[PDB]
Amino acid sequence: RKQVSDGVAHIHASFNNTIVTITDRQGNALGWATAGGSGFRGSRKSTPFAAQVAAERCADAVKEYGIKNLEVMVKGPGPGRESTIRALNAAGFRITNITDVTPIPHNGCRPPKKRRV
RNA sequence: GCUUGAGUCUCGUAGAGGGGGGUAGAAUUCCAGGUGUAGCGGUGAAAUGCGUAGAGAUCUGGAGGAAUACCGGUGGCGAAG
Ligand SMILES: [Mg+2]
Ligand SMILES: [Mg+2]
Ligand SMILES: [Mg+2]
């Protein structure tokens, strides 16, 4: 076991799902939870409520580490991004800093074709 | 014969105009390794499909190909494309 001050939490917010993972600052995984794993299937999985419950599940799953003064980084355009940080605060974790990062390609390569619906 | 059309010379200016050779950084994919463990992905709603031979997530290194966020315009160049 270990007690980690200044651990890093990763938020990946797809349109269809949300993933929460806790790693040491060098990216070594400590614990992870998910909306789909929270007892959700299909369209329910994109709701911000699902993200909140997923964040609580992640926090509880990793309690055995003495994690304090958390840092949170968020990626993706999906919904419920803010809800996860609210959850980690509510879980009791102390949050020092918060950052956004999402890959931009600088016109790298071709995306799929437009959707006629 | 003439200098008003047309052309030559001297000095400057702007430009994604054209051909050849180098080089840069962001990103998708693949491969190796560490962390790690059971879902991911998708949709109107699903299923097909992918993962315990270790996926997805996250971190380190390597390979290859193609296009050049922002500036950027209500802009410029070209006989047209
Ligand atoms: Mg050129
Ligand atoms: Mg492998
Ligand atoms: Mg013109």
Swiss-Prot record:
The gene is rpsK. Gene3D superfamilies: Ribosomal protein S11 (3.30.420.80). This is Small ribosomal subunit protein uS11. Keywords: Methylation, Ribonucleoprotein, Ribosomal protein, RNA-binding, rRNA-binding. Has been predicted to contact the N-terminal domain of IF-3 based on footprint studies; exactly how IF-3 interacts with the 30S subunit is controversial. One of its GO terms (molecular function) is small ribosomal subunit rRNA binding. HAMAP family: Ribosomal_uS11. The keyword Heme does not apply.
